[PDB]
PDB file of C-alpha atoms (C1' of nucleotides) in Angstrom:
ATOM      1  CA  UNK S   1      12.346 -89.084  15.823  1.00  0.00           C
ATOM      2  CA  UNK S   2       9.848 -89.580  13.233  1.00  0.00           C
ATOM      3  CA  UNK S   3       6.975 -87.566  15.058  1.00  0.00           C
ATOM      4  CA  UNK S   4       4.417 -87.422  17.521  1.00  0.00           C
ATOM      5  CA  UNK S   5       0.953 -89.563  17.793  1.00  0.00           C
ATOM      6  CA  UNK S   6      -1.957 -87.668  19.209  1.00  0.00           C
ATOM      7  CA  UNK S   7      -3.567 -89.407  21.727  1.00  0.00           C
ATOM      8  CA  UNK S   8      -6.767 -87.692  22.089  1.00  0.00           C
ATOM      9  CA  UNK S   9      -7.355 -86.645  18.286  1.00  0.00           C
ATOM     10  CA  UNK S  10      -5.846 -90.059  17.360  1.00  0.00           C
ATOM     11  CA  UNK S  11      -3.324 -89.265  14.776  1.00  0.00           C
ATOM     12  CA  UNK S  12      -0.066 -88.966  13.697  1.00  0.00           C
ATOM     13  CA  UNK S  13       1.588 -85.710  12.711  1.00  0.00           C
ATOM     14  CA  UNK S  14       5.024 -86.444  10.688  1.00  0.00           C
ATOM     15  CA  UNK S  15       8.331 -84.318  11.856  1.00  0.00           C
ATOM     16  CA  UNK S  16      10.337 -83.368   8.966  1.00  0.00           C
ATOM     17  CA  UNK S  17      13.950 -82.746   9.875  1.00  0.00           C
ATOM     18  CA  UNK S  18      15.414 -79.166  10.022  1.00  0.00           C
ATOM     19  CA  UNK S  19      12.659 -76.808   8.844  1.00  0.00           C
ATOM     20  CA  UNK S  20      12.990 -75.256  12.479  1.00  0.00           C
ATOM     21  CA  UNK S  21      13.374 -71.616  10.698  1.00  0.00           C
ATOM     22  CA  UNK S  22       9.421 -71.801   9.757  1.00  0.00           C
ATOM     23  CA  UNK S  23       6.456 -74.012  10.333  1.00  0.00           C
ATOM     24  CA  UNK S  24       6.870 -77.012   8.382  1.00  0.00           C
ATOM     25  CA  UNK S  25       3.763 -78.808   6.342  1.00  0.00           C
ATOM     26  CA  UNK S  26       1.383 -80.201   8.542  1.00  0.00           C
ATOM     27  CA  UNK S  27       1.555 -84.356   7.738  1.00  0.00           C
ATOM     28  CA  UNK S  28      -0.894 -86.269   9.191  1.00  0.00           C
ATOM     29  CA  UNK S  29      -1.407 -90.175   9.068  1.00  0.00           C
ATOM     30  CA  UNK S  30      -5.271 -90.860  10.282  1.00  0.00           C
ATOM     31  CA  UNK S  31      -5.361 -94.358  11.855  1.00  0.00           C
ATOM     32  CA  UNK S  32      -3.256 -95.204  15.192  1.00  0.00           C
ATOM     33  CA  UNK S  33      -3.501 -98.923  13.419  1.00  0.00           C
ATOM     34  CA  UNK S  34      -3.698 -97.254   9.719  1.00  0.00           C
ATOM     35  CA  UNK S  35      -0.768 -99.464   7.440  1.00  0.00           C
ATOM     36  CA  UNK S  36       0.266 -95.898   6.308  1.00  0.00           C
ATOM     37  CA  UNK S  37       1.496 -95.249   9.906  1.00  0.00           C
ATOM     38  CA  UNK S  38       3.561 -98.197   9.418  1.00  0.00           C
ATOM     39  CA  UNK S  39       4.860 -97.314   6.254  1.00  0.00           C
ATOM     40  CA  UNK S  40       5.790 -93.613   7.073  1.00  0.00           C
ATOM     41  CA  UNK S  41       7.557 -94.915  10.231  1.00  0.00           C
ATOM     42  CA  UNK S  42       8.199 -98.136   9.582  1.00  0.00           C
ATOM     43  CA  UNK S  43       6.544-100.951  11.001  1.00  0.00           C
ATOM     44  CA  UNK S  44       9.075-101.788  13.657  1.00  0.00           C
ATOM     45  CA  UNK S  45       8.849 -98.330  14.980  1.00  0.00           C
ATOM     46  CA  UNK S  46       5.247 -98.337  14.606  1.00  0.00           C
ATOM     47  CA  UNK S  47       4.559-101.484  17.092  1.00  0.00           C
ATOM     48  CA  UNK S  48       6.828 -99.753  19.557  1.00  0.00           C
ATOM     49  CA  UNK S  49       4.120 -96.972  19.406  1.00  0.00           C
ATOM     50  CA  UNK S  50       1.387 -99.355  20.331  1.00  0.00           C
ATOM     51  CA  UNK S  51       3.133-101.371  22.771  1.00  0.00           C
ATOM     52  CA  UNK S  52       4.251 -97.965  24.834  1.00  0.00           C
ATOM     53  CA  UNK S  53       1.088 -96.959  24.446  1.00  0.00           C
ATOM     54  CA  UNK S  54      -0.871 -99.833  25.773  1.00  0.00           C
ATOM     55  CA  UNK S  55       1.353 -99.217  28.785  1.00  0.00           C
ATOM     56  CA  UNK S  56       0.725 -95.861  28.955  1.00  0.00           C
ATOM     57  CA  UNK S  57      -3.107 -96.175  29.617  1.00  0.00           C
ATOM     58  CA  UNK S  58      -2.778 -98.405  32.247  1.00  0.00           C
ATOM     59  CA  UNK S  59      -0.223 -95.986  34.068  1.00  0.00           C
ATOM     60  CA  UNK S  60      -0.758 -92.385  33.316  1.00  0.00           C
ATOM     61  CA  UNK S  61      -4.157 -90.339  33.229  1.00  0.00           C
ATOM     62  CA  UNK S  62      -6.842 -88.961  31.269  1.00  0.00           C
ATOM     63  CA  UNK S  63      -6.519 -84.931  30.734  1.00  0.00           C
ATOM     64  CA  UNK S  64      -8.766 -83.288  33.023  1.00  0.00           C
ATOM     65  CA  UNK S  65      -9.372 -79.644  32.363  1.00  0.00           C
ATOM     66  CA  UNK S  66     -10.753 -79.206  36.478  1.00  0.00           C
ATOM     67  CA  UNK S  67      -7.455 -80.809  37.996  1.00  0.00           C
ATOM     68  CA  UNK S  68      -5.164 -78.785  35.377  1.00  0.00           C
ATOM     69  CA  UNK S  69      -6.808 -75.478  36.809  1.00  0.00           C
ATOM     70  CA  UNK S  70      -6.584 -77.401  40.522  1.00  0.00           C
ATOM     71  CA  UNK S  71      -2.611 -77.885  39.779  1.00  0.00           C
ATOM     72  CA  UNK S  72      -2.875 -81.725  40.112  1.00  0.00           C
ATOM     73  CA  UNK S  73      -2.529 -83.206  36.896  1.00  0.00           C
ATOM     74  CA  UNK S  74      -0.177 -81.685  33.509  1.00  0.00           C
ATOM     75  CA  UNK S  75      -0.689 -82.126  30.238  1.00  0.00           C
ATOM     76  CA  UNK S  76       2.760 -83.082  28.655  1.00  0.00           C
ATOM     77  CA  UNK S  77       3.459 -82.438  24.884  1.00  0.00           C
ATOM     78  CA  UNK S  78       6.672 -83.754  23.538  1.00  0.00           C
ATOM     79  CA  UNK S  79       8.142 -82.191  20.988  1.00  0.00           C
ATOM     80  CA  UNK S  80      11.004 -80.040  19.545  1.00  0.00           C
ATOM     81  CA  UNK S  81      11.362 -76.361  20.226  1.00  0.00           C
ATOM     82  CA  UNK S  82      14.264 -76.410  18.184  1.00  0.00           C
ATOM     83  CA  UNK S  83      12.645 -78.559  15.088  1.00  0.00           C
ATOM     84  CA  UNK S  84       9.571 -76.423  15.295  1.00  0.00           C
ATOM     85  CA  UNK S  85       7.504 -79.208  15.778  1.00  0.00           C
ATOM     86  CA  UNK S  86       5.233 -79.839  18.747  1.00  0.00           C
ATOM     87  CA  UNK S  87       4.373 -75.835  19.916  1.00  0.00           C
ATOM     88  CA  UNK S  88       1.229 -75.361  18.256  1.00  0.00           C
ATOM     89  CA  UNK S  89      -0.625 -78.406  19.978  1.00  0.00           C
ATOM     90  CA  UNK S  90       0.607 -77.400  23.622  1.00  0.00           C
ATOM     91  CA  UNK S  91      -0.421 -73.793  22.169  1.00  0.00           C
ATOM     92  CA  UNK S  92      -3.470 -75.302  21.155  1.00  0.00           C
ATOM     93  CA  UNK S  93      -3.917 -76.392  24.538  1.00  0.00           C
ATOM     94  CA  UNK S  94      -2.925 -73.530  25.906  1.00  0.00           C
ATOM     95  CA  UNK S  95      -5.510 -71.565  24.056  1.00  0.00           C
ATOM     96  CA  UNK S  96      -8.014 -74.245  24.820  1.00  0.00           C
ATOM     97  CA  UNK S  97      -7.533 -74.882  28.430  1.00  0.00           C
ATOM     98  CA  UNK S  98      -5.617 -71.970  30.192  1.00  0.00           C
ATOM     99  CA  UNK S  99      -7.428 -69.091  32.615  1.00  0.00           C
ATOM    100  CA  UNK S 100      -8.725 -66.096  31.103  1.00  0.00           C
ATOM    101  CA  UNK S 101      -6.996 -62.985  33.917  1.00  0.00           C
ATOM    102  CA  UNK S 102      -7.622 -64.057  37.435  1.00  0.00           C
ATOM    103  CA  UNK S 103      -8.393 -62.509  40.704  1.00  0.00           C
ATOM    104  CA  UNK S 104      -5.629 -61.473  42.653  1.00  0.00           C
ATOM    105  CA  UNK S 105      -5.870 -60.979  46.374  1.00  0.00           C
ATOM    106  CA  UNK S 106      -5.171 -57.795  48.430  1.00  0.00           C
ATOM    107  CA  UNK S 107      -5.436 -56.831  52.304  1.00  0.00           C
ATOM    108  CA  UNK S 108      -8.999 -55.396  51.425  1.00  0.00           C
ATOM    109  CA  UNK S 109     -10.971 -57.883  48.873  1.00  0.00           C
ATOM    110  CA  UNK S 110     -11.013 -60.649  46.284  1.00  0.00           C
ATOM    111  CA  UNK S 111     -10.584 -58.493  43.314  1.00  0.00           C
ATOM    112  CA  UNK S 112     -12.242 -60.048  39.870  1.00  0.00           C
ATOM    113  CA  UNK S 113     -11.007 -59.658  36.711  1.00  0.00           C
ATOM    114  CA  UNK S 114     -14.369 -59.030  35.649  1.00  0.00           C
ATOM    115  CA  UNK S 115     -14.802 -55.558  37.511  1.00  0.00           C
ATOM    116  CA  UNK S 116     -14.135 -52.306  35.671  1.00  0.00           C
ATOM    117  CA  UNK S 117     -12.286 -49.565  37.647  1.00  0.00           C
ATOM    118  CA  UNK S 118      -8.228 -50.018  36.702  1.00  0.00           C
ATOM    119  CA  UNK S 119      -6.438 -51.951  39.164  1.00  0.00           C
ATOM    120  CA  UNK S 120      -2.852 -53.072  38.551  1.00  0.00           C
ATOM    121  CA  UNK S 121       0.178 -53.776  40.312  1.00  0.00           C
ATOM    122  CA  UNK S 122       3.439 -53.468  38.796  1.00  0.00           C
ATOM    123  CA  UNK S 123       5.602 -56.078  39.528  1.00  0.00           C
ATOM    124  CA  UNK S 124       9.045 -55.135  37.993  1.00  0.00           C
ATOM    125  CA  UNK S 125      11.030 -52.865  36.741  1.00  0.00           C
ATOM    126  CA  UNK S 126      13.337 -54.441  34.081  1.00  0.00           C
ATOM    127  CA  UNK S 127      16.956 -54.088  33.613  1.00  0.00           C
ATOM    128  CA  UNK S 128      16.408 -50.752  31.804  1.00  0.00           C
ATOM    129  CA  UNK S 129      19.007 -50.183  29.333  1.00  0.00           C
ATOM    130  CA  UNK S 130      17.473 -48.557  27.004  1.00  0.00           C
ATOM    131  CA  UNK S 131      17.811 -46.992  23.767  1.00  0.00           C
ATOM    132  CA  UNK S 132      18.215 -43.010  24.501  1.00  0.00           C
ATOM    133  CA  UNK S 133      16.728 -43.018  28.313  1.00  0.00           C
ATOM    134  CA  UNK S 134      16.636 -44.329  31.787  1.00  0.00           C
ATOM    135  CA  UNK S 135      13.168 -44.967  31.296  1.00  0.00           C
ATOM    136  CA  UNK S 136      12.881 -47.982  33.832  1.00  0.00           C
ATOM    137  CA  UNK S 137       9.452 -48.286  32.791  1.00  0.00           C
ATOM    138  CA  UNK S 138       7.697 -50.129  35.565  1.00  0.00           C
ATOM    139  CA  UNK S 139       6.142 -53.628  34.053  1.00  0.00           C
ATOM    140  CA  UNK S 140       2.476 -53.596  35.557  1.00  0.00           C
ATOM    141  CA  UNK S 141      -0.076 -56.240  35.356  1.00  0.00           C
ATOM    142  CA  UNK S 142      -3.545 -55.269  34.967  1.00  0.00           C
ATOM    143  CA  UNK S 143      -5.728 -57.102  37.505  1.00  0.00           C
ATOM    144  CA  UNK S 144      -9.310 -55.643  36.622  1.00  0.00           C
ATOM    145  CA  UNK S 145     -10.658 -52.550  34.508  1.00  0.00           C
ATOM    146  CA  UNK S 146      -9.655 -50.828  31.217  1.00  0.00           C
ATOM    147  CA  UNK S 147      -6.894 -48.589  31.039  1.00  0.00           C
ATOM    148  CA  UNK S 148      -7.165 -45.900  28.574  1.00  0.00           C
ATOM    149  CA  UNK S 149      -4.534 -43.564  27.536  1.00  0.00           C
ATOM    150  CA  UNK S 150      -5.668 -40.002  29.087  1.00  0.00           C
ATOM    151  CA  UNK S 151      -7.036 -41.687  32.118  1.00  0.00           C
ATOM    152  CA  UNK S 152      -6.466 -40.735  36.158  1.00  0.00           C
ATOM    153  CA  UNK S 153      -5.126 -43.075  38.639  1.00  0.00           C
ATOM    154  CA  UNK S 154      -4.118 -43.552  42.202  1.00  0.00           C
ATOM    155  CA  UNK S 155      -0.971 -44.818  43.534  1.00  0.00           C
ATOM    156  CA  UNK S 156      -1.908 -46.321  46.968  1.00  0.00           C
ATOM    157  CA  UNK S 157       1.511 -46.189  48.731  1.00  0.00           C
ATOM    158  CA  UNK S 158       2.235 -42.844  48.162  1.00  0.00           C
ATOM    159  CA  UNK S 159      -1.345 -41.697  48.438  1.00  0.00           C
ATOM    160  CA  UNK S 160      -0.907 -39.373  45.511  1.00  0.00           C
ATOM    161  CA  UNK S 161      -2.980 -39.351  42.223  1.00  0.00           C
ATOM    162  CA  UNK S 162      -1.368 -39.513  38.993  1.00  0.00           C
ATOM    163  CA  UNK S 163      -2.498 -38.676  35.146  1.00  0.00           C
ATOM    164  CA  UNK S 164      -1.506 -41.258  32.868  1.00  0.00           C
ATOM    165  CA  UNK S 165       0.006 -40.581  29.450  1.00  0.00           C
ATOM    166  CA  UNK S 166       2.941 -42.368  27.792  1.00  0.00           C
ATOM    167  CA  UNK S 167       1.795 -45.833  29.019  1.00  0.00           C
ATOM    168  CA  UNK S 168       4.271 -48.408  27.440  1.00  0.00           C
ATOM    169  CA  UNK S 169       2.995 -51.359  25.664  1.00  0.00           C
ATOM    170  CA  UNK S 170       5.681 -54.319  25.207  1.00  0.00           C
ATOM    171  CA  UNK S 171       5.998 -55.653  21.451  1.00  0.00           C
ATOM    172  CA  UNK S 172       8.403 -58.117  22.693  1.00  0.00           C
ATOM    173  CA  UNK S 173      11.600 -56.643  24.434  1.00  0.00           C
ATOM    174  CA  UNK S 174      10.814 -53.520  22.774  1.00  0.00           C
ATOM    175  CA  UNK S 175       8.561 -50.392  23.706  1.00  0.00           C
ATOM    176  CA  UNK S 176       5.604 -49.365  21.734  1.00  0.00           C
ATOM    177  CA  UNK S 177       3.410 -46.676  21.418  1.00  0.00           C
ATOM    178  CA  UNK S 178       1.145 -47.318  23.595  1.00  0.00           C
TER     179      UNK S 178
ATOM    180  C1'   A N   1      15.130  17.389  46.885  1.00  0.00           C
ATOM    181  C1'   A N   2      17.029  14.311  42.663  1.00  0.00           C
ATOM    182  C1'   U N   3      25.312  11.919  41.663  1.00  0.00           C
ATOM    183  C1'   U N   4      28.251  16.267  47.935  1.00  0.00           C
ATOM    184  C1'   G N   5      32.511  11.563  47.962  1.00  0.00           C
ATOM    185  C1'   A N   6      38.658   9.363  48.392  1.00  0.00           C
ATOM    186  C1'   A N   7      42.385   5.356  55.028  1.00  0.00           C
ATOM    187  C1'   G N   8      46.485   1.676  54.136  1.00  0.00           C
ATOM    188  C1'   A N   9      49.305  -2.543  55.965  1.00  0.00           C
ATOM    189  C1'   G N  10      53.470  -6.524  55.018  1.00  0.00           C
ATOM    190  C1'   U N  11      58.429  -7.740  52.262  1.00  0.00           C
ATOM    191  C1'   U N  12      65.304  -5.334  49.892  1.00  0.00           C
ATOM    192  C1'   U N  13      69.130  -3.265  54.715  1.00  0.00           C
ATOM    193  C1'   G N  14      73.524  -3.741  60.257  1.00  0.00           C
ATOM    194  C1'   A N  15      70.294   0.333  59.763  1.00  0.00           C
ATOM    195  C1'   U N  16      68.179   5.052  56.658  1.00  0.00           C
ATOM    196  C1'   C N  17      65.535   7.174  52.642  1.00  0.00           C
ATOM    197  C1'   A N  18      63.849   6.820  47.478  1.00  0.00           C
ATOM    198  C1'   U N  19      62.780   3.768  43.826  1.00  0.00           C
ATOM    199  C1'   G N  20      60.256  -0.485  42.217  1.00  0.00           C
ATOM    200  C1'   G N  21      57.740  -5.136  41.929  1.00  0.00           C
ATOM    201  C1'   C N  22      55.426  -9.060  44.744  1.00  0.00           C
ATOM    202  C1'   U N  23      51.034  -9.594  48.798  1.00  0.00           C
ATOM    203  C1'   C N  24      47.363  -8.525  52.188  1.00  0.00           C
ATOM    204  C1'   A N  25      42.103  -5.865  54.321  1.00  0.00           C
ATOM    205  C1'   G N  26      36.885  -4.554  50.294  1.00  0.00           C
ATOM    206  C1'   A N  27      33.295  -4.701  47.238  1.00  0.00           C
ATOM    207  C1'   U N  28      31.556  -8.574  43.436  1.00  0.00           C
ATOM    208  C1'   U N  29      29.535 -14.107  40.718  1.00  0.00           C
ATOM    209  C1'   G N  30      24.505 -17.835  36.450  1.00  0.00           C
ATOM    210  C1'   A N  31      30.249 -19.986  40.238  1.00  0.00           C
ATOM    211  C1'   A N  32      32.292 -24.635  41.530  1.00  0.00           C
ATOM    212  C1'   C N  33      34.609 -28.100  45.472  1.00  0.00           C
ATOM    213  C1'   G N  34      35.131 -29.262  51.061  1.00  0.00           C
ATOM    214  C1'   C N  35      32.428 -29.573  55.975  1.00  0.00           C
ATOM    215  C1'   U N  36      27.917 -28.710  56.995  1.00  0.00           C
ATOM    216  C1'   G N  37      22.709 -27.673  56.695  1.00  0.00           C
ATOM    217  C1'   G N  38      15.597 -26.381  59.639  1.00  0.00           C
ATOM    218  C1'   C N  39      12.206 -22.872  57.580  1.00  0.00           C
ATOM    219  C1'   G N  40       9.845 -19.308  53.989  1.00  0.00           C
ATOM    220  C1'   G N  41       9.355 -15.247  50.560  1.00  0.00           C
ATOM    221  C1'   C N  42      11.170 -13.571  46.029  1.00  0.00           C
ATOM    222  C1'   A N  43      14.589 -14.227  42.034  1.00  0.00           C
ATOM    223  C1'   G N  44      18.219 -17.142  39.379  1.00  0.00           C
ATOM    224  C1'   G N  45      19.672 -21.684  36.715  1.00  0.00           C
ATOM    225  C1'   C N  46      24.914 -25.377  29.850  1.00  0.00           C
ATOM    226  C1'   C N  47      29.244 -20.378  31.013  1.00  0.00           C
ATOM    227  C1'   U N  48      31.549 -26.471  28.134  1.00  0.00           C
ATOM    228  C1'   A N  49      30.211 -29.414  22.332  1.00  0.00           C
ATOM    229  C1'   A N  50      26.322 -23.870  16.544  1.00  0.00           C
ATOM    230  C1'   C N  51      27.836 -31.807  19.742  1.00  0.00           C
ATOM    231  C1'   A N  52      24.499 -35.848  18.332  1.00  0.00           C
ATOM    232  C1'   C N  53      19.389 -36.721  19.309  1.00  0.00           C
ATOM    233  C1'   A N  54      14.583 -41.880  21.304  1.00  0.00           C
ATOM    234  C1'   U N  55       9.402 -40.494  22.727  1.00  0.00           C
ATOM    235  C1'   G N  56       4.898 -37.057  23.769  1.00  0.00           C
ATOM    236  C1'   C N  57       3.304 -31.867  22.678  1.00  0.00           C
ATOM    237  C1'   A N  58       4.862 -26.599  21.021  1.00  0.00           C
ATOM    238  C1'   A N  59      -0.353 -23.635  14.870  1.00  0.00           C
ATOM    239  C1'   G N  60      -4.048 -24.149  13.353  1.00  0.00           C
ATOM    240  C1'   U N  61      -8.999 -22.100  12.480  1.00  0.00           C
ATOM    241  C1'   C N  62     -13.410 -20.619   9.920  1.00  0.00           C
ATOM    242  C1'   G N  63     -19.678 -24.748   6.985  1.00  0.00           C
ATOM    243  C1'   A N  64     -22.905 -16.639   8.079  1.00  0.00           C
ATOM    244  C1'   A N  65     -16.990 -19.443   1.648  1.00  0.00           C
ATOM    245  C1'   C N  66     -18.522 -24.567  -1.402  1.00  0.00           C
ATOM    246  C1'   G N  67     -19.494 -29.250  -3.073  1.00  0.00           C
ATOM    247  C1'   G N  68     -21.011 -32.061   1.115  1.00  0.00           C
ATOM    248  C1'   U N  69     -22.011 -36.531   4.113  1.00  0.00           C
ATOM    249  C1'   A N  70     -18.162 -40.295   7.142  1.00  0.00           C
ATOM    250  C1'   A N  71     -19.291 -40.110  12.435  1.00  0.00           C
ATOM    251  C1'   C N  72     -22.636 -38.411  17.535  1.00  0.00           C
ATOM    252  C1'   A N  73     -27.623 -35.403  17.951  1.00  0.00           C
ATOM    253  C1'   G N  74     -33.229 -33.463  17.234  1.00  0.00           C
ATOM    254  C1'   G N  75     -37.101 -34.705  14.430  1.00  0.00           C
ATOM    255  C1'   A N  76     -39.405 -37.766   9.297  1.00  0.00           C
ATOM    256  C1'   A N  77     -43.382 -39.448   4.859  1.00  0.00           C
ATOM    257  C1'   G N  78     -43.922 -44.935   6.743  1.00  0.00           C
ATOM    258  C1'   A N  79     -43.779 -49.409  10.043  1.00  0.00           C
ATOM    259  C1'   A N  80     -43.296 -49.559  15.309  1.00  0.00           C
ATOM    260  C1'   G N  81     -39.042 -50.546  21.733  1.00  0.00           C
TER     261        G N  81
END
RNA sequence: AAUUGAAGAGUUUGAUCAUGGCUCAGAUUGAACGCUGGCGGCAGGCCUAACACAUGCAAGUCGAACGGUAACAGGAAGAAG
């Protein structure tokens, strides 16, 4: 494993072995026929890249944002989460293409994310240990509207209005105020 | 007018009386447990570890004390939305 050639940026990010604990030095080789790709990767491996890329173009797909959002093509990234190599592109891809908050359906209406008036829905009451409480802390999604600490909300099911104060924000498997 | 209220029974012996302990009926509870459980009023609720505590809150207030401008507000010598 020498790295990955980016098809759309037309350049080659070079993998360094065992820097998986931090982020390695970004070391690019610009051209796909740049004779430094041959030097940095060995001309043998360099041609197999060129060969495979030929076949790839005749049997694959161009990334189309519309078909991706329709769930009909997947952008495939090759990498290694252990070597911490490939993660950041798929992130660039994540930020670049992936939807802002989407509308959730209800027995009333299509609920736009753009709307105001808070509208969350739980979805999980995680395996609450939890360092000094039963807590439970139900995990809510927030479909629309802005939550603010002292606001008053309505539990639709029990039809009882509830005031909110202690409302967790989870900084990675960890309660945080708030 | 304002403290004027006191019950005994069971068991030692073949039987008896006396002694004498044990036990029972009452009232009481910050109670617990078992079975059960429909309301409401009022009150009560760590008696054990003065054992250790995540999180929020439980003490601040005066510009008619003072230098003052960091915010929202009125208006300004001048330009104007």
